[PDB]
Amino acid sequence: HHHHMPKIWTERIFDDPEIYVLRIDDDRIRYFEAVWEIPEGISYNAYLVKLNGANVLIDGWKGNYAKEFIDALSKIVDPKEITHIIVNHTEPDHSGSLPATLKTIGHDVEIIASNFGKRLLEGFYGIKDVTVVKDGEEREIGGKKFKFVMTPWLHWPDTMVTYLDGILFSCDVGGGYLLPEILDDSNESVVERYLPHVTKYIVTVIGHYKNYILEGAEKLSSLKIKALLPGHGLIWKKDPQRLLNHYVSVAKGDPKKGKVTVIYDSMYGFVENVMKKAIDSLKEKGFTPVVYKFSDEERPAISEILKDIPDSEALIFGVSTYEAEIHPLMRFTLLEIIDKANYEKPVLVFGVHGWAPSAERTAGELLKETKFRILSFTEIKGSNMDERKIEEAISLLKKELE
Amino acid sequence: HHMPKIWTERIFDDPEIYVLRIDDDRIRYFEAVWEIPEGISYNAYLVKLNGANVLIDGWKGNYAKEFIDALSKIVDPKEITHIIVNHTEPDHSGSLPATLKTIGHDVEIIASNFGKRLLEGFYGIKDVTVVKDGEEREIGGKKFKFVMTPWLHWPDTMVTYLDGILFSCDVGGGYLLPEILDDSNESVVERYLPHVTKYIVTVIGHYKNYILEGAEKLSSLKIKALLPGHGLIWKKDPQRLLNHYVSVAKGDPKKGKVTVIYDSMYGFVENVMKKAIDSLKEKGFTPVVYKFSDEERPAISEILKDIPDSEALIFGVSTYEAEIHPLMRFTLLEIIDKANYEKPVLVFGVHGWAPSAERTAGELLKETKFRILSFTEIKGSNMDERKIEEAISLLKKELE
Ligand SMILES: [Cl-]
Numbered sequence: 001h002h003h004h005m006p007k008i009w010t011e012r013i014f015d016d017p018e019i020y021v022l023r024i025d026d027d028r029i030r031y032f033e034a035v036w037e038i039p040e041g042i043s044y045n046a047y048l049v050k051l052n053g054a055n056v057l058i059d060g061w062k063g064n065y066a067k068e069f070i071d072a073l074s075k076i077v078d079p080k081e082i083t084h085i086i087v088n089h090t091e092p093d094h095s096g097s098l099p100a101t102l103k104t105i106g107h108d109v110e111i112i113a114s115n116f117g118k119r120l121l122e123g124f125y126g127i128k129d130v131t132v133v134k135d136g137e138e139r140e141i142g143g144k145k146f147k148f149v150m151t152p153w154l155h156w157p158d159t160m161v162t163y164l165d166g167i168l169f170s171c172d173v174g175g176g177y178l179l180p181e182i183l184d185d186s187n188e189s190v191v192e193r194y195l196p197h198v199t200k201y202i203v204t205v206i207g208h209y210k211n212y213i214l215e216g217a218e219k220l221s222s223l224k225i226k227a228l229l230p231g232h233g234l235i236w237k238k239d240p241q242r243l244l245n246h247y248v249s250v251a252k253g254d255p256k257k258g259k260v261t262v263i264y265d266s267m268y269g270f271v272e273n274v275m276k277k278a279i280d281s282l283k284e285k286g287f288t289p290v291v292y293k294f295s296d297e298e299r300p301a302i303s304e305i306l307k308d309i310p311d312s313e314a315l316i317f318g319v320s321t322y323e324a325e326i327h328p329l330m331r332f333t334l335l336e337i338i339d340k341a342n343y344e345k346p347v348l349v350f351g352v353h354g355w356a357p358s359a360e361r362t363a364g365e366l367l368k369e370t371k372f373r374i375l376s377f378t379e380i381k382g383s384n385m386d387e388r389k390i391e392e393a394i395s396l397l398k399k400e401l402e
Numbered sequence: 403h404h405m406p407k408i409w410t411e412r413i414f415d416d417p418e419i420y421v422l423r424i425d426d427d428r429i430r431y432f433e434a435v436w437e438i439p440e441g442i443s444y445n446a447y448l449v450k451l452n453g454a455n456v457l458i459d460g461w462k463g464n465y466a467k468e469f470i471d472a473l474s475k476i477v478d479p480k481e482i483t484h485i486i487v488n489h490t491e492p493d494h495s496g497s498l499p500a501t502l503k504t505i506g507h508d509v510e511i512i513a514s515n516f517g518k519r520l521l522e523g524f525y526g527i528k529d530v531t532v533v534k535d536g537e538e539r540e541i542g543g544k545k546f547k548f549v550m551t552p553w554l555h556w557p558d559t560m561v562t563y564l565d566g567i568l569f570s571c572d573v574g575g576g577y578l579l580p581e582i583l584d585d586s587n588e589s590v591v592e593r594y595l596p597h598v599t600k601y602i603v604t605v606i607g608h609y610k611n612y613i614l615e616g617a618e619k620l621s622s623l624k625i626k627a628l629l630p631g632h633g634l635i636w637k638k639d640p641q642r643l644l645n646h647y648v649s650v651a652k653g654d655p656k657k658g659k660v661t662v663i664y665d666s667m668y669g670f671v672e673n674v675m676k677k678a679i680d681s682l683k684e685k686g687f688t689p690v691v692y693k694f695s696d697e698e699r700p701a702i703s704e705i706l707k708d709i710p711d712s713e714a715l716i717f718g719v720s721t722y723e724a725e726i727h728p729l730m731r732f733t734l735l736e737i738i739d740k741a742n743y744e745k746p747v748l749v750f751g752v753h754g755w756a757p758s759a760e761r762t763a764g765e766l767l768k769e770t771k772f773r774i775l776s777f778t779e780i781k782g783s784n785m786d787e788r789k790i791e792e793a794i795s796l797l798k799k800e801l802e
């Protein structure tokens with residue numbers, strides 16, 4: 001499958017403070033967290049800060065790349081001269097190289113983490129001597145002031161960001177999928193192509209906690225932010241506020257005019273027939289549908305469905321009945337939308353009237369517990385159906401959005 | 403240019419019976435869910451009698467033109483007098499509207515009571531003769547007997563008995579595009595039956611108790627051949643197929659077989675499972691292993707196929723947010739829905755910091771027939787690897 005080793009970037013990105021990035025481009029991974037389809041890949045970004053009397057490592061790489069990490073680090077510093085390691089987030093996509101790193105340094109170093117971070121490092125790796133920093137705590141290290149800001153539930157309770165002279169090292173906060181062709185936000189075209197992969201990352205990794213994005217953005221707003229250096233994806237040296245505003249806009253679900261996401265299963269073609277008419281009606285009325293169909297020949301990626309929800313003006317679901325409940329892939333999709341992408345947006349539901357036991361929960365009653373506002377339910381029938389009901393539903397949606 | 407393969411062949415001389423089989427190699431997901439890279443066939447039958455020609459079932463609607471073309475090579479469709487619809491699901495009935503149009507005059511359509519309702523619902527077909535359980539009809543000088551076998555897997559399902567020959571539609575079906583039409587080669591049969599298990603669990607598993615009821619019901623008939631709507635025709639040894647259906651429905655286990663199902667996000671679950679699997683092997687078990695990882699994602703249909711004849715299951719689970727890993731949730735829910743068997747299970751789990759409200763793997767299994775012998779904690783440091791051995795040894799003792 002893979003013809004080459006993962007691409008590694010090692011570059012000085014600031015002169016004062018002297019900061020290096022160590023980035024590896026993981027094109028081996030297929031499913032982030034063993035669930036989210038990312039054919040585009042993801043990078044892991046670690047940093048080294050070379051100071052006067054200290055060398056500070058910030059974060060690390062996934063453990064399957066530990067050997068590559070130590071080789072890359074050794075090119076920019078003798079690992080024996082490392083004095084501090086800052087662990088903003090202990091998840092193994094960032095901390096997996098830490099045991100090998102500690103072994104290669106060969107002497108004690110100060111490891112800095114949050115309170116929960118300390119507990120997790122002990123749990124994962126048996127690392128015991130960890131210095132805990134509290135919210136807003138400052139430490140003078142190598143002649144410079146580091147400040148630690150807790151940003152819990154982005155997306156674990158251990159998560160924090162490290163601030164140095166206007167430079168924020170933010171680990172998952174500000175991350176995205178995709179392996180960008182450059183390191184930073186200097187080129188407009190690269191940024192525009194990258195941002196939808198940031199949306200996909202936010203919803204899939206942080207969506208359940210999208211309220212804590214808003215709390216975190218507010219907390220970070222009080223800091224002077226000159227640059228944002230995340231643990232995945234692009235570095236933002238020019239316009240970090242653009243990334244923060246994007247995060248907030250995704251978390252708030254700010255809609256793109258005209259965008260309607262249509263998600264359905266069609267076991268035999270009856271749902272398809274109705275959805276095709278609904279989609280054509282939407283197009284006639286000036287909307288731009290984004291369509292995800294589960295059929296006997298096609299299966300969308302759940303990560304891609306999730307990506308499209310936040311900026312949708314509305315959603316339309318087309319549902320088959322199956323046994324006592326609904327179609328299994330539709331169940332999975334709805335449960336993940338509820339978990340990751342629970343937004344106050346209008347919805348239409350189209351469904352086959354089956355013969356499921358009345359005890360079975362409908363797609364409709366599952367959706368009724370969410371923030372979504374179901375405008376109407378429309379029955380999908382084989383023969384004898386009133387196609388005027390499809391147009392009525394789409395017209396109702398148009399009037400709602402007007 | 404590749405076209406799905408069509409078989410049209412005379413398979414009995416008296417009565418004169420033809421199969422019309424199409425080998426669907428376009429379909430990827432049966433019922434839009436079950437992964438079937440092996441494909442599935444649609445088998446319809448024509449019985450040519452003295453004064454009648456009886457079509458039994460049909461093909462999926464995307465192959466309606468092909469169906470009419472193939473049918474027209476063995477009979478003038480205008481000479482069809484009767485159509486028997488054992489089951490109205492569109493994989494069998496989709497060609498019916500085109501068939502009716504091509505015949506061009508009224509025919510007697512025969513179905514169960516619920517079948518009749520479904521034909522009207524799907525297609526607007528109103529002229530349907532409802533046959534009752536055990537009803538016999540004389541058509542073309544021969545006696546057809548109709549037997550209701552409901553919930554295999556819809557309430558409309560029946561089978562048609564003709565002189566020892568059972569047209570069974572989904573009952574007795576399998577996935578796979580077999581290399582020959584019938585059960586006349588052992589190697590073909592052996593390779594086929596696991597795809598029959600896959601089919602039973604995925605399509606009929608929720609209603610597996612009705613397999614046992616249906617088999618008991620049919621036991622009063624002398625069956626010389628079984629002609630289903632998918633897969634192989636059984637002319638030599640239909641008993642072998644029926645026994646297979648029953649043993650899957652009962653979950654009769656293969657001694658030594660344990661199915662191990664887990665997710666591993668960062669290698670901690672993998673490390674524990676590798677040790678559990680090695681321990682199983684050292685004690686003489688033959689594990690079947692399904693791992694959800696950041697590079698690999700098994701098909702749920704393949705996991706399901708392996709349940710019924712496992713002596714036991716082992717799950718390795720990560721906690722995730724308030725609940726468990728999302729693919730393990732999906733997997734567990736499908737096992738509970740399709741493969742609810744009275745089998746022992748071991749659970750190995752990571753201890754999360756999930757909200758206590760969220761349901762565990764244990765809560766999901768509580769109302770099922772599965773019994774959890776033990777739960778063991780997966781830890782990343784200072785974990786007691788003795789605990790794994792103890793669990794596997796507990797399971798072996800339980801299975802004696
Ligand atoms: Cl459908």
Ligand SMILES: [Cl-]
Pocket residue numbers: 665666667668669670671672720
């Ligand atoms: Cl893990």
Ligand SMILES: [Cl-]
Pocket residue numbers: 331332335731732735
């Ligand atoms: Cl699910």
